[PDB]
Write an enzyme that holds these catalytic residues in place. Sequence first.
Site, PDB file in Angstrom:
ATOM      1  N   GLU A  35      30.245  53.965  37.833  1.00  0.00           N
ATOM      2  CA  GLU A  35      29.012  54.207  38.892  1.00  0.00           C
ATOM      3  C   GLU A  35      30.009  52.584  40.070  1.00  0.00           C
ATOM      4  O   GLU A  35      29.937  53.598  40.845  1.00  0.00           O
ATOM      5  CB  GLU A  35      27.544  53.653  38.175  1.00  0.00           C
ATOM      6  N   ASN A  46      25.150  56.286  50.899  1.00  0.00           N
ATOM      7  CA  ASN A  46      24.917  57.929  50.455  1.00  0.00           C
ATOM      8  C   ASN A  46      24.646  58.055  51.862  1.00  0.00           C
ATOM      9  O   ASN A  46      24.338  58.159  53.255  1.00  0.00           O
ATOM     10  CB  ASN A  46      23.652  57.933  49.584  1.00  0.00           C
ATOM     11  N   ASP A  48      22.546  60.396  52.974  1.00  0.00           N
ATOM     12  CA  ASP A  48      20.881  60.106  53.881  1.00  0.00           C
ATOM     13  C   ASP A  48      20.905  58.381  54.568  1.00  0.00           C
ATOM     14  O   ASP A  48      20.448  58.948  54.971  1.00  0.00           O
ATOM     15  CB  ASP A  48      20.455  60.631  52.939  1.00  0.00           C
ATOM     16  N   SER A  50      20.792  55.730  52.210  1.00  0.00           N
ATOM     17  CA  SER A  50      20.492  55.492  51.819  1.00  0.00           C
ATOM     18  C   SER A  50      21.473  54.686  50.925  1.00  0.00           C
ATOM     19  O   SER A  50      22.862  54.906  51.473  1.00  0.00           O
ATOM     20  CB  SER A  50      19.615  56.071  50.477  1.00  0.00           C
ATOM     21  N   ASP A  52      23.160  52.571  47.680  1.00  0.00           N
ATOM     22  CA  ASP A  52      23.361  52.623  46.251  1.00  0.00           C
ATOM     23  C   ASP A  52      24.299  50.765  45.924  1.00  0.00           C
ATOM     24  O   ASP A  52      25.039  50.858  46.685  1.00  0.00           O
ATOM     25  CB  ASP A  52      24.944  53.720  45.594  1.00  0.00           C
ATOM     26  N   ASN A  59      19.583  53.380  43.737  1.00  0.00           N
ATOM     27  CA  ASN A  59      19.983  53.483  44.882  1.00  0.00           C
ATOM     28  C   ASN A  59      18.278  53.030  46.348  1.00  0.00           C
ATOM     29  O   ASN A  59      17.005  53.006  45.089  1.00  0.00           O
ATOM     30  CB  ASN A  59      19.391  55.533  44.935  1.00  0.00           C
TER      31      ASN A  59
END
Length: 129
Positions: A35, A46, A48, A50, A52, A59
């Site tokens: 990750e 991300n 969209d 969002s 991380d 998220n």
Amino acid sequence: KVFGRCELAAAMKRHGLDNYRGYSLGNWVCAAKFESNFNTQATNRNTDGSTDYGILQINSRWWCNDGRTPGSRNLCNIPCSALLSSDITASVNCAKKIVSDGNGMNAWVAWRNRCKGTDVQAWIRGCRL
Ligand SMILES: [Ca+2]
């Protein structure tokens, strides 16, 4: 902070992660490396909008408030900033809650693709746990 393999392993174990919800420590170390490469500060968008955050790339679409994420919830009632400290405690607490979402560790795209179904214990190993 960028952990090495074992440093984080002991850290995760100290925090109660070996076999939390039946996920051995190696699972938690594996997933972190892919990750975040063990970078507690790692952040990633991300597509969209969002974001991380942290060692397990938690998220903002669901799990922390960063104040700038559309259709997002703050389920760990924590600011996404708290997932970035050299102290992994915030990240560990949210991921304890995340893994009990009923999806288990499949919450983590990298764990599912790159840890799930491998000899994960090869991640702790040679580590003074
Ligand atoms: Ca499970």
